[PDB]
Point group: D2
Chain length 212, copies 4
Amino acid sequence: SRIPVVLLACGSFNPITNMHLRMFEVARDHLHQTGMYQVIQGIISPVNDTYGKKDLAASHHRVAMARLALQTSDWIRVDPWESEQAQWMETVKVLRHHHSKLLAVPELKLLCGADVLKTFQTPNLWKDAHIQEIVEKFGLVCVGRVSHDPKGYIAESPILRMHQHNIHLAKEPVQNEISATYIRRALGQGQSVKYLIPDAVITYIKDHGLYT
Amino acid sequence: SRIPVVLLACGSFNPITNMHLRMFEVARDHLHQTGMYQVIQGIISPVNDTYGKKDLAASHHRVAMARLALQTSDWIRVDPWESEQAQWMETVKVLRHHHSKLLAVPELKLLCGADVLKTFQTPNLWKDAHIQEIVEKFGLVCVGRVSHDPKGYIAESPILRMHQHNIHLAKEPVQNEISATYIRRALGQGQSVKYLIPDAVITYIKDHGLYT
Amino acid sequence: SRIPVVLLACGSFNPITNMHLRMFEVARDHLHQTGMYQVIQGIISPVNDTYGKKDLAASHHRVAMARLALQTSDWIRVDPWESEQAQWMETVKVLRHHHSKLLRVPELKLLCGADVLKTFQTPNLWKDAHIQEIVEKFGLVCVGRVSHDPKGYIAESPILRMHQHNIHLAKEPVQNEISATYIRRALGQGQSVKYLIPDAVITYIKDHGLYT
Amino acid sequence: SRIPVVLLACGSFNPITNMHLRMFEVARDHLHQTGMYQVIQGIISPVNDTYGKKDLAASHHRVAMARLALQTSDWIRVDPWESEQAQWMETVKVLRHHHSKLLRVPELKLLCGADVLKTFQTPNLWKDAHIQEIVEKFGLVCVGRVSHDPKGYIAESPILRMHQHNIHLAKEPVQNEISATYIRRALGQGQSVKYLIPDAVITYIKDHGLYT
Ligand SMILES: Nc1ncnc2c1ncn2[C@@H]1O[C@H](COP(=O)(O)CP(=O)(O)OP(=O)(O)O)[C@@H](O)[C@H]1O
Ligand SMILES: Nc1ncnc2c1ncn2[C@@H]1O[C@H](COP(=O)(O)CP(=O)(O)OP(=O)(O)O)[C@@H](O)[C@H]1O
Ligand SMILES: Nc1ncnc2c1ncn2[C@@H]1O[C@H](COP(=O)(O)CP(=O)(O)OP(=O)(O)O)[C@@H](O)[C@H]1O
Ligand SMILES: Nc1ncnc2c1ncn2[C@@H]1O[C@H](COP(=O)(O)CP(=O)(O)OP(=O)(O)O)[C@@H](O)[C@H]1O
Ligand SMILES: NC(=O)c1ccc[n+]([C@@H]2O[C@H](COP(=O)(O)O)[C@@H](O)[C@H]2O)c1
Ligand SMILES: NC(=O)c1ccc[n+]([C@@H]2O[C@H](COP(=O)(O)O)[C@@H](O)[C@H]2O)c1
Ligand SMILES: NC(=O)c1ccc[n+]([C@@H]2O[C@H](COP(=O)(O)O)[C@@H](O)[C@H]2O)c1
Ligand SMILES: NC(=O)c1ccc[n+]([C@@H]2O[C@H](COP(=O)(O)O)[C@@H](O)[C@H]2O)c1
């Protein structure tokens, strides 16, 4: 039988976009195509507001937009736990929490874009022990992104190389590089972002005057 | 006052995708940013089935998918006229028809991707007299596409160069090259295309067993 | 033993660029990795001047630039035959001519980008009989390009899908979308195109006042 | 009269590629088109070997390749100072050193791709004081890259948006996303990278057995 799997996506989702959502679908199909996995659930976990960030909309709104975006999904849900904590928590800790939650046990994997993988190389950004635990105890499902070479990042990292069987590279012959940064600026300029992010999310942004 | 404008998009829409729809939004914002136009409507006109094509799903289905995709749009509608004709009609004729329909009169412009513009250079593809009438009597709103240089196509074409004031180049700093061809193959392989095309279109394709 | 292969690329090469050149290298590495072939030579064949077209520099200029571009190549060369003919010639006929030369035996395959492959669908652009001869008698090596889905073009063409064993899809993991149209416009504006096309081609362009 | 400018690019240049080089040309053409400047020289400054990093070839090798790459450049040169220092140095400090050299006056601006600009947000990666000195004392010229929205990074950074007059966004109309990570992996697999990086750099790599 196929190993059951839960995909966990950490990040800003400021706001959640069609590409963030597309990421989950590509990862699930890739894992199923291997013939040894069955993805049973996806989790969108918005980052805590304390994460010293450019400036994110309040997490209350980011969780809301994700919930609304996921209404038409029968397997992906938002989980506010991470954003409800008194403060920012390292990713490996969110994985531990959601793993405990799950506790015949499905494997919990971190779903991210290849760019995140490139950041593992940034000095002080990630603790080597976290990089190791993330790839060894949980797993990584990385979706391709233009300009990044996931296979090379893996080969050049002693830690990732050693646990590469637990890293799954997925990529669809599509080219969709819509950045939430662009989305925010377009919204701020009164321009349309329709068809770049869900209609339900555009409605919420309009109703609550976000990204002005 | 701003000149009123109707955007007409001709093509396969086999099936209509988020990018086809995105094209309309980018064009409208570009025309409004000029300060001299007010886009009052968009028309999606699926190509007749007789158009000797690879093989398109029946036009009945393509019109349906467009209608469903456009349910959440308050300014874009599908018009089956072109596909209901006994046979394929040159684009300039569809423009004339929709122009007559409109008949204090708004300008009707052909909305297309920069790749279509590149095809004007293909021998026998378009009649020079049609290329001229299309750009002179109606107008062109072209949305950028990776790999194409619209400005160069215009400069190297005596006809387009002469009527370049009637060609409007729009492009959003986004990279979305999802091809309907890829969509069809993904569907045929049982893979997800969710978030690449509208949920309402995926539902119809599933219910009617299309693209198998 | 490996099947000896010769790759032929037809196109305007107006001017030849680094992507044109990259195409040969990618196609060769791909054929070699199959293990069934051994590419022994590449041939750049500039189209004839009568090819009812845009802003096409005189053929001898395009042959000379390709030649300068190829000086650092140990296996690729430009063959002026096609451009030196009196009139334009369908591509199958260029494939027959070079097939003849090969006999004063290596397999002669047509090398092109995915965009060319999509043109096989354009009404009346190619004779079905020619598309068949190309992939049945000779062979087709296609390099990926952004926005194109080669596998889908092949599956949807009743002619191509029957000859899949002779069609090789070479994947381009590097986003390298340089447009010659862009190259020409930039030059005409006095902007740099260095590192986009060969240094010697740039010098030649300048010395002969091309693309102004 | 025009303000004399010197462009400084810091990075690993491991190895230097055609996109790295293209970056200088694009930035120069952009500064010149403003009319307020006249770029008099470009400087490639390879990072020091102690830069806690990946698979970094010895600095003298990276300086030599950059030098071979720059032989056909009449205005760009590599300066080994940074790599020849004893330890790694924050970029502002490299900007001060070269600012000093300039005085044995030209404006010294930091040249980088949009992706670098997005890293100014990464927690603790850059000192706010340094980001300020960079765009207040010196200046920043940024070349566009796929998936990045520079205008948005600038607007959302309270530091950057205050110094917009010293930040220049150079647009790259050519999709040229070459990854050095990819270059290295391809080489290690014995695949060609010709036309992606300079011929002489390839020769040097081979002669010194780099990236195997
Ligand atoms: N277009 C895309 N394709 C593939 N993955 C993407 C993607 N856009 C975002 N992602 C991934 O989605 C996850 C969350 O992204 P975010 O934290 O929202 C940064 P972003 O989406 O780039 O917006 P930004 O502009 O605020 O940085 C990350 O793993 C990121 O790699
Ligand atoms: N991703 C994209 N970005 C901008 N324009 C696009 C686009 N995809 C399609 N278009 C435009 O939408 C119009 C209709 O396209 P279609 O006739 O459906 C061809 P297509 O969308 O490329 O699907 P295909 O794979 O069947 O060729 C054309 O003007 C085309 O240029
Ligand atoms: N950037 C690129 N990547 C992959 N293939 C490319 C390419 N640019 C051109 N080609 C391929 O090179 C061959 C000849 O191309 P050309 O006839 O010169 C069209 P082009 O290079 O786009 O110039 P154009 O814009 O003047 O038409 C074709 O097979 C084409 O697909
Ligand atoms: N393809 C590209 N287009 C535009 N800028 C690029 C580029 N590739 C690299 N650069 C720029 O060149 C400078 C130095 O880059 P490097 O430090 O070598 C990272 P890289 O080139 O991506 O190699 P890497 O994959 O080993 O990290 C940076 O400003 C970077 O943005
Ligand atoms: N060391 C860590 O655990 C670590 C470091 C950087 C980013 N992250 C996470 O990655 C996601 C995206 O972060 P960025 O916005 O910095 O790219 C967030 O959920 C963030 O918490 C975790
Ligand atoms: N000469 C003409 O009027 C002409 C030529 C080619 C395509 N078209 C139109 O462009 C749209 C897309 O055509 P393709 O599927 O061939 O790219 C269709 O609506 C088609 O009718 C019109
Ligand atoms: N019917 C045919 O054999 C046919 C049709 C179109 C293009 N071609 C060739 O393929 C290349 C296409 O170049 P363009 O797309 O710039 O016209 C040229 O070499 C051209 O000669 C051949
Ligand atoms: N805080 C700083 O001054 C700082 C931080 C990160 C990178 N850098 C520099 O910018 C370039 C970045 O290279 P990488 O992204 O490969 O680390 C290097 O030259 C590096 O030295 C400087």
